[PDB]
UniProtKB/Swiss-Prot annotation, chain A:
Listed name of the protein: Proteasome subunit alpha type-5
A cellular-component GO term for this protein: nucleus
Family: Belongs to the peptidase T1A family.
Lineage: Eukaryota, Fungi, Dikarya, Ascomycota, Saccharomycotina
InterPro entries, sorted: Ntn_hydrolases_N (IPR029055), Proteasome_alpha (IPR050115), Proteasome_alpha-type (IPR023332), Proteasome_alpha_type_5 (IPR033812), Proteasome_asu_N (IPR000426), Proteasome_sua/b (IPR001353)
Organism, as annotated: Saccharomyces cerevisiae (strain ATCC 204508 / S288c)
Swiss-Prot record, chain D:
Protein name: 26S proteasome subunit RPT4
Entry's family note: Belongs to the AAA ATPase family.
Organism: Saccharomyces cerevisiae (strain ATCC 204508 / S288c)
Domain of life: Eukaryota
Post-translational modification: N-acetylated by NAT1.
Function: The 26S proteasome is involved in the ATP-dependent degradation of ubiquitinated proteins. The regulatory (or ATPase) complex confers ATP dependency and substrate specificity to the 26S complex.
UniProtKB/Swiss-Prot annotation, chain H:
Signal peptide feature range: none
Keyword entries, A-Z: Cytoplasm, Isopeptide bond, Nucleus, Phosphoprotein, Proteasome, Ubl conjugation
Family matches, as InterPro entries: Ntn_hydrolases_N, Proteasome_alpha, Proteasome_alpha-type, Proteasome_asu_N, Proteasome_sua/b
Transmembrane region(s): none
Function: The proteasome degrades poly-ubiquitinated proteins in the cytoplasm and in the nucleus. It is essential for the regulated turnover of proteins and for the removal of misfolded proteins. The proteasome is a multicatalytic proteinase complex that is characterized by its ability to cleave peptides with Arg, Phe, Tyr, Leu, and Glu adjacent to the leaving group at neutral or slightly basic pH. It has an ATP-dependent proteolytic activity.
CC terms in the record's Gene Ontology section: nucleus; proteasome complex; proteasome core complex, alpha-subunit complex; proteasome storage granule
Record-given protein name: Proteasome subunit alpha type-6
Cross-link Glycyl lysine isopeptide (Lys-Gly) (interchain with G-Cter in ubiquitin) mapped to chain: K190
Modified residues (Phosphoserine): S13
Gene name, Swiss-Prot/TrEMBL: PRE5
PROSITE patterns for the chain: PROTEASOME_ALPHA_1 (PS00388), PROTEASOME_ALPHA_2 (PS51475)
Cell compartment(s), UniProt: Cytoplasm; Nucleus
Note: Present with 7210 molecules/cell in log phase SD medium.
From Swiss-Prot, chain I:
Disulfide bond residue pairs: none
InterPro entries in the record: Ntn_hydrolases_N, Proteasome_alpha, Proteasome_alpha-type, Proteasome_asu_N, Proteasome_bsu_CS, Proteasome_sua/b
Recorded coiled-coil stretches: none
Keyword Nucleus on entry: yes
Gene Ontology, cellular component aspect: cytosol; nucleus; proteasome complex; proteasome core complex, alpha-subunit complex; proteasome storage granule
Gene label: PRE9
UniProt protein name: Proteasome subunit alpha type-3
Superkingdom, taxonomy of origin: Eukaryota
The organism's taxonomic lineage, starting at the top: Eukaryota, Fungi, Dikarya, Ascomycota, Saccharomycotina
Keywords: Cytoplasm, Isopeptide bond, Nucleus, Proteasome, Ubl conjugation
Cross-link (Glycyl lysine isopeptide (Lys-Gly) (interchain with G-Cter in ubiquitin)): K99, K198, K230
Length: 242, 243, 241, 87, 250, 243, 205, 233, 244
């Protein structure tokens, strides 16, 4: 029972600290950025067998060459994507080009902490900051493939391999020794599914998990259920070796 | 009840305000500042406490001058002291636009007076915890005023507030008996430096700085400027002679 | 107006204005519905405590947003009128702006998207009602059944129920109904909804309202005598089996 | 509370046995007294003695008096205006 | 910015009522008691002037104001918000009627506008309900002479005769047997004097009692002649000497 | 629910807690003053108390001039006193340009009272901790004095007063009117009216004042002015000679 | 200047001298075919010691002269005795922004214990300047030759009246838009003195 | 601790302080550490960049305003972007309207006016990020230290961040050294490296951790990242 | 700060309801009792005033009843202050439909527009909801005779016989068993008289404490006639029905 601008004794806002804890309360989103492409994946976490695979979509498309995933509460994610596509597609009209991935992350993260009650100097109406974590990926003609993370605190870092949600601790440390600069696009697909299989309740299938891909030519592409099932069958052969 | 000291507009059972009283304690936690009023003009002086050797000498000006005829010195929170001059700067610009000739000293006191009064009437804002001393040479004679956090002010022959308020301002009473007929503007500069060192007994634990500025019709002729050159160093040796 | 925020993150990471709003749906009338291949059926109950309620003058529990799609909610009736009116205006606004008939997918994300605003808008409170949008897209016979939660999360379901005694009906729809082989006839879709209402309505007639959704903008509302016809056939095969 | 006319004779009571200089004015402390009482002037006469000890003065100068008179007005926090029972 | 309180100070109590309007009626009994009596030939209202200081002037203090020339008003207690309500009532009465319909509103329509201002204070935030209770009495061409009781909660009720204030318990009961169908204007004045005299524990004279009566249309109170249509206002304020004439009349 | 006493709302006793403390704020300064109605004019007196010698006696005043035809005296803290002072001057100017000729005394006391009633009813504004007392000479009712309470209730007085000793001062002005059975002083000259109110103030307070201890306002017909130090001291000369 | 609006014009002038300043104006108001009001007065008092005349459109000056009284009332009560430079600046800001809607001539003059009398005239543009003598209006168009030749610095009270009386007489006989009785005001250290003439007096000189 | 008196932004403590100002002040001391110094003809700004993972990058702690000036942030990162927009807006305001570059002395006063509005009014909050303003004009190089309250004071050099106050020991003994060094930008940059090294405990300065931005008369403001600062390690 | 004095008018309780709305429903039981009856040939409305005495004016007054339209009546049970706000906006919204579409407004459209006002304060505005309940009865050529009621929560449902105010469940018990579909206008009056007599707190029942406004249909079909019973006509039906 206080204002959203009240600082904690640690020097932080109460709205910022409790928003980071809502990330683990939702699903787990894992992705890896390589030199040949960025492999992103999410977990639908179906609570009932009657849930359709096309129901929950945690991977949207901001641009043909730029894509992102969501985790946790998806209520705040849909609002950010509307502003993310606004700061992107409209930016194409201004400069007649594609917006930078790092520049697009700044415009999206700046809309988090602008909330308040009766903000002086201008009109800002927001009840609470966004409690959703977004992993921003894309490709450009200069820096190359990059994978960022949009935090509710307004800060962003460039991660080569990042695991958010419930896998922000156990599944995050497993990607330290399994990542390498020479990792290709095909080997990265089996590496993500290898982590998603161990962190999932039941067996890994196309209904409980959805993966995407971002390349230079094809751009943002979502793996088909038949394409995903072929990668899962190849994963079982990699689990049993010696 | 409980919580009368929480918000602003809530009165105390004896008819006073706690937030106004709490703002007075914030005035005595800052650097002290004094003032001297004469017939030709007024003299401003402030003692700036130096924290460490990282401070650059004489590159910091605490006194914010309103137009050419009004200097302003404050003792208290630095952010709250600059907002009063910035508000008075717009009042002086709005006055000279419609009213032509610059605003006199007793007229400029009403702009800062009512503006602080509005902060005590709202629960969404807080009163200023800084005491600003302003003055100069008006169209007729001269005047000096000291704005208190409560908004109460009057004409002052001298004004001092800060850590040395109990000391420096107590020495102003001896200045009246010393020159009951009148005091020149040049002699008031040397007397202002001595008052700083008389109240320095509590400031001896840190490093100090002397900044003196005066305005009158005898020399500057309606120009408020800081003391520089050999005039500032001359007042230091005369003040430190009795110390 | 009122600029003070309401929804605040709990120290556990949740929101009080959300979870406490979900209890209003669980205390309301249960709304269950299923979808077949060629048809979609949305059942709804009423309050059995109040009597002397004329069915004709009483507004239907299933609100029709468009000719090809309707809305049957469960929850606070005070917050439902706000969603029904704003969804129908957007239905005509979409026909004005894009000159296209609305789709069930666009209607669900709009209503769920509007609910995301009030949760994020300081000075207002989230809706305490959950709506079920079911219909058919233009030039498409594929059934579309979408759930809209008060928190703003929407999803598609073959058979889903909300309201009181929801977990009892959900466990009944998983074993009895199969999503891989849905019924291709309208009569089997109506009898399936009645079987789910036997454990909630608990031997009642005038308190049951079933709405049949058919493609090509065809809506046939079952009357009081038509609903009891399917109830009798099921009760004869229930106790005897 | 003794007024300006009532306190005028009180300053000479507390300073009667206190040694001081030949030139003295008690009318200055009358205006300096804000809401004081008859006893608080004894405090003003007591603090004036210790101010002359550091300067090695057996007689209290009038300048040391005005410093001690305001010293009570500097402290404050005694309230004293909250008694409404005067009738 | 300005004010950050947009919420209403009046909330529903767990007992099923509003805590603000409940204590508002209590504050009406904390001050001077007014009254009024409606008759066939006019409406007679009366009140008492309680001077906080013995050197105060009762002529400058008017407890009976004038909204429209045909309708008077009287309050109870000190009436802190009474000046605010009357200033806002005279504006809405002339704007919505005199500036639109060209004529002054009747008694039934004016009390609805007076209560329209008080009912907004109990709902719209940033303000508190009015702790005053007025009495709307006047004459029109349809309802005739009518007296309405304005409650501090924002509701109005018609009454033949009523007395609200510190002595509202005893004074209202005494007016039940003293009122009947056939009464005159001067006959209703003696009814007000016998009831008010028992409620006055202080000095009893004409300067401490303001007696306002509504009679026929008086050409002397009009100010112009030659127009037979307007014969002057019905409401009239009795002077100090005319009130003392009826005090010894008992 | 201890916040019921911190704002203005209906109390379970049927009263207002914050309004009760508004009257208590006027006794913080402890300044006694009174006003009497003469024959053709009105003269108001006030006790001038200067705590420190550094204050300019000409700058410190408890009597403010709203317009040429209207004077004002206010009791209590100066910040709330000068807050309503500039608000009263704005209402006097708006009445001259828009409405008509110069504002009389009763209209100024009524508009300032209704302005405080809005601040009292609305919970986001605290009431003024001072008391507005206006003196002037009307061209119709003649001399009149209207004392505006901080609760927003204005009423006319014959001879009024202010301060914590008002109840003891009122007895002096009351007993004089009971024996003579007159509502105003019959002295036509305004000079005798000045010495009239000063005589009753000295005997009531038991203190002989000086030229700097009192400020006597004089409101004549369509004119208002404040007596200087020489004019106030001249009145005290004839008082000691007659009595 | 629209069609059908009342315009004062005529001739208004002020001449400073040693003991003070004396203004003057006529009583005639004429728009183009007809003399509307011959008994009126163009003198306006914004303050006891500060006087202001009115020229050009009548309502344009009467509205501005009243607004200045609203500003000087807040200026005098809150501060003190006004001066001639401050009062003339209020007329400038009102005519600067309203120059499109409000276009009229204004001449402001006052008395002081230091600078004595000063004359500040505002043309249709809205600027204000200091001049020892200033004329405005339609009647004053013909007096430019007489006022400049016979003007003297620091004259007496008798020479100041005779200078204005003979100047305004040429603005009447030679211009039909101006005429009537001559209304003049005298500003000295004693107070305000009113002086009025008649058509049977100055026309015989 | 937590909320007792000053938890409301408009409330004053009985000791004459403000906890909300103290809460945001402690955010800088727990943030990223940075140092700085200046000379007559040059000014050197050295900042340290951290992160939560080895695979993660390092967010830049130095924001560029114009070619003649720059700054650094220690505190919450997005709170400095809002203040940087107000500072860059005044740089283009004086460039378009006055055709002049924004002075360092006038930039501190305009930056103080932004923070004082949120502290004196309810509903706002003071920025808990520090700003070290560097730049050059016709007068010379100037360095400023921003606080959550908005205090602006010109200094030769200072440090804000984790264990930054303890790193001032090297700046005090060398205070008489770098102030007399003119025309030697390489030595002035290396002076800031030894100052920030006093606060290093766990990890030392590396290629990606070290961020140095120098500004001067003939040399405009330039941010050196990557291998550009590898030679100054 | 303004957060401490705010009582949080509209918030979701742990039980899933609203605090101010739950307490506003109790205020109806502390007000007069309004009982509507929908007959075959018309609609009969009943009401009882609270706090009445001899000094009350019985000539022209209606506390619990008003007329929003020629073909539509209304029954007011609740706080009178909060009632006039919705009643004034009712005639405005009713004439706007008649000003544009140039036809008589039905009851279903009139209630849902007024209910959205009560639903607005329960969502935004940070204010209290209206603590007054209404019963809307009118004639229409679409669904026929329509009888609806409202609540402080802003919900409306169809009702053949509705009872609000004091003793809500006590009156509805006698109305359920004695209701018939063939009940005419004359038989509907006897149903309200016997109900209000047994559910009151007094011994006898007079005509000063009751209010009745019905809707009668004349010989010409398609248009009804709104008739508010005067105190002279109220005491007449008490003798003919045997209530006295």
């Amino acid at each position: 029972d206080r204002g959203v601008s009240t600082f904690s004794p640690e020097g932080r806002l109460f709205q910022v600290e409790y928003s980071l804890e809502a990330i683990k309360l939702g699903s787990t989103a894992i992705g890896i950025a390589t030199k040949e492409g960025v492999v992103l994946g999410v977990e639908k976490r179906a609570t009932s067998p009657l849930l359709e695979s096309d129901s929950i979509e945690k991977i949207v498309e901001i641009d043909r060459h730029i894509g992102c995933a969501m985790s946790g509460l998806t209520a705040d994610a849909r609002s950010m994507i509307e502003h993310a596509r606004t700061a992107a597609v409209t930016h194409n009209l201004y400069y007649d080009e594609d917006i930078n991935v790092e520049s697009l992350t700044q415009s999206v993260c700046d809309l988090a902490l602008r909330f308040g009650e009766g903000a002086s100097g201008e009109e800002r109406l927001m009840s609470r900051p966004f409690g959703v974590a977004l992993l921003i990926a894309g490709h450009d003609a200069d820096d190359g493939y990059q994978l960022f993370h949009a935090e509710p605190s307004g800060t962003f870092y460039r991660y080569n391999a990042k695991a958010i949600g419930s896998g922000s601790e156990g599944a995050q440390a497993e990607l330290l020794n399994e990542w390498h600069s020479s990792l290709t696009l095909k080997e990265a697909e089996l590496l993500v599914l290898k982590i998603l299989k161990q962190v999932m309740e039941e067996k890994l299938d196309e209904n409980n998990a959805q993966l995407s891909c971002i390349t230079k030519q094809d751009g943002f592409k979502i793996y088909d259920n038949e394409k995903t099932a072929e990668l899962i069958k190849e994963l079982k052969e990699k689990e049993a070796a010696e | 009840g409980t919580g009368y000291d929480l918000s602003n507009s809530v009165f105390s059972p004896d008819g006073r305000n706690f937030q106004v009283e709490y703002a007075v304690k914030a005035v005595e936690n800052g650097t002290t500042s004094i003032g001297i009023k004469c017939n030709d003009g007024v003299v401003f002086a402030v003692e700036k406490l130096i924290t460490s050797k990282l401070l650059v000498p004489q590159k910091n000006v605490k006194i914010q001058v309103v137009d050419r005829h009004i200097g302003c010195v404050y003792s208290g929170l630095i952010p709250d002291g600059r907002h009063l001059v910035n508000r008075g700067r717009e009042e002086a610009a709005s006055f000279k636009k419609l009213y032509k000739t610059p605003i006199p000293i007793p007229a400029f006191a009403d702009r800062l007076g009512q503006y602080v009064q509005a902060h005590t009437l709202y629960n969404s804002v807080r009163p200023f915890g800084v005491s600003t001393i302003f003055g100069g040479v008006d169209k007729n004679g001269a005047h000096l005023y000291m704005l208190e956090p409560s908004g109460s002010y009057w004409g002052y022959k001298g004004a001092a507030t800060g850590k040395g308020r109990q000391s420096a301002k107590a020495e102003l009473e001896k200045l009246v008996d010393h020159h009951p007929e009148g005091l020149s503007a040049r002699e008031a500069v040397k007397q202002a430096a001595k008052i700083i060192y008389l109240a320095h007994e509590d400031n001896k634990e840190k490093d100090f700085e002397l900044e003196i500025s005066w305005c009158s019709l005898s020399e500057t002729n309606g120009l408020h400027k800081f003391v520089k050159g050999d005039l500032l160093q001359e007042a230091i040796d005369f003040a430190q002679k009795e110390i | 107006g009122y600029d003070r925020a309401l929804s605040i993150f709990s120290p556990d990471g949740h929101i009080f204005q959300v979870e406490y709003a979900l209890e209003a749906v669980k205390r309301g009338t249960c709304a269950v519905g299923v979808k077949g291949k060629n048809c979609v059926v949305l059942g709804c109950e009423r309050r059995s405590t109040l009597k002397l309620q004329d069915t004709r003058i009483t507004p239907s529990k299933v609100s029709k947003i468009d000719s090809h799609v309707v809305l049957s909610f469960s929850g606070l009736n005070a917050d439902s009128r706000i969603l029904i009116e704003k969804a129908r205006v957007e239905a005509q606004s979409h026909r004005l702006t894009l000159e296209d008939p609305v789709t069930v997918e666009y209607l669900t994300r709009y209503v769920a998207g509007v609910q995301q605003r009030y949760t994020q808008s300081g000075g207002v409170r989230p809706f305490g009602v959950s709506t079920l949008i079911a219909g058919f897209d233009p030039r498409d016979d594929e059934p579309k059944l979408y759930q809209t939660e008060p928190s703003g999360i929407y999803s598609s379901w073959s058979a889903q129920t909300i309201g009181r005694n929801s977990k009892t009906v959900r466990e009944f729809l998983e074993k009895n109904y199969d999503r891989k082989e849905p019924p291709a006839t309208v009569e089997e879709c109506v009898k399936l909804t009645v079987r789910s209402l036997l454990e909630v309505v608990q031997t009642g007639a005038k308190n049951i309202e079933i709405t049949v959704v058919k493609p090509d903008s065809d809506i046939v509302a079952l009357s009081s005598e038509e609903i009891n016809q399917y109830v009798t056939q099921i009760e004869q095969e229930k106790q005897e089996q | 509370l003794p007024n300006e006319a009532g306190r005028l004779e009180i300053f000479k009571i507390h300073t009667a046995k206190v040694k001081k200089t030949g030139e003295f004015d008690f009318e200055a402390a009358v205006k300096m007294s804000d809401g004081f009482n008859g006893a608080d002037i004894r405090n003003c006469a007591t603090e004036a003695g210790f101010f002359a000890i550091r300067d090695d003065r057996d007689h209290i100068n009038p300048d040391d008096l005005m410093k001690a008179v305001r010293k009570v007005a500097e402290v404050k926090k005694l309230e004293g205006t909250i008694e409404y029972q005067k009738l | 910015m300005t004010d950050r309180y947009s919420f209403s100070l009046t909330t529903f109590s767990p007992s099923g009522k509003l805590g603000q309007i409940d204590y508002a009626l209590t504050a009406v009994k904390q001050g001077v008691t007014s009254l009024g009596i409606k008759a066939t030939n006019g409406v007679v209202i009366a009140t008492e002037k309680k001077s906080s200081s013995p050197l105060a002037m009762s002529e400058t203090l008017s407890k009976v104001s004038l909204l429209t020339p045909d309708i008077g008003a009287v309050y109870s207690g000190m009436g802190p918000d009474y000046r605010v309500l009357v200033d806002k009532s005279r504006k809405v009465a002339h704007t919505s009627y005199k500036r639109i319909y060209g004529e002054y509103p009747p008694t039934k329509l004016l009390v609805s506008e007076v209560a329209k201002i008080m009912q907004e204070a109990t709902q719209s935030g940033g303000v508190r309900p009015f702790g005053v209770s007025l009495l709307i009495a006047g004459h029109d061409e349809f309802n005739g002479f009518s007296l309405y009781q304005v409650d501090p909660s924002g509701s109005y009720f018609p009454w033949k005769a009523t007395a609200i204030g510190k002595g509202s318990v005893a004074a209202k009961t005494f007016l039940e047997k003293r009122w009947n169908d056939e009464l005159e204007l001067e006959d209703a004045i003696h009814i007000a004097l016998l009831t008010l005299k028992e409620s006055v524990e202080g000095e009893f004279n004409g300067d401490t009692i303001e007696l306002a009566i509504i009679g026929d249309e008086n050409p002397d109170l009009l100010g112009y002649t030659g127009i037979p249509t307007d014969k002057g206002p019905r409401f009239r304020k009795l002077t100090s000497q005319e009130i003392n004439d009826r005090l010894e009349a008992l | 629910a201890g916040y019921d006493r911190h704002i203005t709302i209906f109390s379970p006793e049927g009263r207002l807690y914050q309004v009760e403390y508004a009257f208590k704020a006027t006794n913080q300064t402890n300044i006694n003053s009174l006003a009497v109605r003469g024959k053709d004019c009105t003269v108001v007196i006030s006790q001038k108390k200067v705590p420190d010698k550094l204050l300019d006696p000409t700058t410190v005043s408890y009597i403010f001039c709203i317009s040429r035809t209207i004077g004002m005296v206010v009791n209590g803290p100066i910040p709330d006193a000068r807050n309503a002072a500039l608000r009263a001057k704005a209402e006097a100017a708006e009445f001259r340009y828009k409405y008509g000729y110069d504002m009389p005394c009763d209209v100024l006391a009524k508009r300032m009272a209704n302005l405080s009633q809005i601040y009292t009813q609305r919970a986001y504004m605290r009431p003024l901790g001072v008391i507005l007392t206006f003196v002037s000479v009307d061209e119709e009712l003649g001399p009149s004095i209207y004392k505006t309470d901080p609760a927003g209730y204005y009423v006319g007085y014959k001879a009024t007063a202010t301060g914590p000793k008002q109840q003891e001062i009122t007895t002096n002005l009351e007993n004089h009117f009971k024996k003579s059975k007159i509502d105003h002083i019959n002295e036509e000259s305004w000079e005798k009216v000045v010495e009239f109110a000063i005589t009753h103030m000295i005997d009531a307070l038991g203190t002989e004042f000086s030229k700097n201890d009192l400020e006597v306002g004089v409101a004549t017909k369509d004119k208002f002015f404040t007596l200087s130090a020489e004019n106030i001291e001249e009145r005290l000369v004839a008082i000691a000679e007659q009595d | 200047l629209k069609k059908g609006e009342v315009s004062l014009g005529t001739s208004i002038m002020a001449v400073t001298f040693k003991d003070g300043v004396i203004l003057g104006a006529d009583s005639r108001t004429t728009t183009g075919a007809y003399i509307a009001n011959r008994v009126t007065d163009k003198l306006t008092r914004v303050h006891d010691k500060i006087w202001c005349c009115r020229s050009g459109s009548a309502a344009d000056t009467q509205a501005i002269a009243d607004i200045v009284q609203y500003h000087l009332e807040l200026y005098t009560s809150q501060y003190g005795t006004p001066s001639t430079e401050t009062a003339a600046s209020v007329f400038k800001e009102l005519c600067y922004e309203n120059k499109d809607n409000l276009t009229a001539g204004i001449i402001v003059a006052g008395y002081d214990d230091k600078n004595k009398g000063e004359v500040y005239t505002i043309p249709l543009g809205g600027s204000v300047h200091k001049l020892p003598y200033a004329i405005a209006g339609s009647g004053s168009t013909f007096i430019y030759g007489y006022c400049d030749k016979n003007f003297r610095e620091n004259m007496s009270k008798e020479e100041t009246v005779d200078f204005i009386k003979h100047s305004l007489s040429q603005a009447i006989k030679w211009d039909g838009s101006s005429g009537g009785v001559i209304r003049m005001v005298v500003l000295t250290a004693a107070g305000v003195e009113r002086l009025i003439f008649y058509p049977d007096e100055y026309e015989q000189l | 601790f937590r909320n007792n008196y000053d938890g409301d932004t408009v409330t004053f403590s009985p000791t004459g302080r403000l906890f909300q100002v103290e809460y945001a002040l402690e955010a800088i001391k727990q943030g990223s550490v940075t140092v700085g110094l200046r000379s007559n003809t040059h000014a050197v700004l050295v900042a340290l960049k951290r992160n939560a993972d080895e695979l993660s990058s390092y967010q830049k702690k130095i924001i560029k305003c114009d070619e003649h000036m720059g700054l650094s942030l220690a505190g919450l990162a997005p709170d400095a972007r809002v203040l940087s927009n107000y500072l860059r807006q005044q740089c283009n305001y004086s460039s378009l309207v006055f055709n002049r570059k924004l002075a360092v002395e006038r930039a501190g006063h305009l930056l103080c006016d932004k923070a004082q509005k949120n502290t004196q009014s309810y509903g706002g909050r003071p920025y808990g990020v520090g700003l070290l303003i560097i730049g050059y004009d016709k007068s010379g190089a100037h360095l400023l230290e921003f606080q959550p309250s908005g205090n602006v004071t010109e200094l030769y050099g200072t440090a804000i961040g984790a264990r930054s106050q303890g790193a001032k020991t090297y700046l005090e003994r060398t205070l008489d050294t770098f102030i007399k060094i003119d025309g030697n930008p390489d030595e002035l940059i290396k002076a800031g490296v030894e100052a920030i090294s006093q606060s290093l405990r766990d990890e030392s300065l590396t290629v990606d951790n070290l961020s140095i931005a120098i500004v001067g008369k003939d040399t405009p403001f330039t941010i050196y990242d990557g291998e550009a600062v590898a030679k100054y390690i | 700060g303004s957060r401490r004095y705010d009582s949080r008018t509209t918030i979701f309780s742990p039980e899933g309801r609203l605090y101010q709305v739950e307490y506003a429903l109790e205020s109806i039981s502390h007000a007069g009792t309004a009982i509507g009856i929908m007959a075959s040939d018309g609609i009969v409305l009943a009401a009882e005033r609270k706090v009445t005495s001899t000094l009350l004016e019985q000539d022209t007054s209606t506390e619990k009843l008003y007329k929003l339209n020629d073909k539509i009546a209304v029954a007011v049970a609740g706080l009178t202050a909060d009632a006039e706000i919705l009643i004034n906006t009712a005639r405005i919204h009713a004439q706007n439909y008649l000003k544009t579409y140039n036809e008589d407004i039905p009851v279903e459209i009139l209630v849902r527009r007024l209910s959205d006002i009560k639903q607005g304060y329960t969502q935004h505005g940070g204010l209290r909801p209206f603590g007054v309940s209404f019963i809307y009865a009118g004639y229409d050529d679409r669904y026929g005779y329509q009888l609806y009621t409202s609540n402080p929560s802003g919900n409306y449902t169809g009702w053949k016989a509705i009872s609000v105010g004091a003793n809500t469940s006590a009156a509805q018990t006698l109305l359920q068993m004695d209701y018939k579909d063939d009940m005419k206008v004359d038989d509907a009056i006897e149903l309200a008289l016997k109900t209000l007599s047994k559910t009151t707190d007094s011994s006898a029942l007079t005509y000063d404490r009751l209010e009745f406004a019905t809707i009668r249909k004349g010989a010409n079909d398609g248009e009804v006639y709104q008739k508010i019973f005067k105190p002279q006509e109220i005491k007449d039906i008490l003798v003919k029905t045997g209530i006295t």
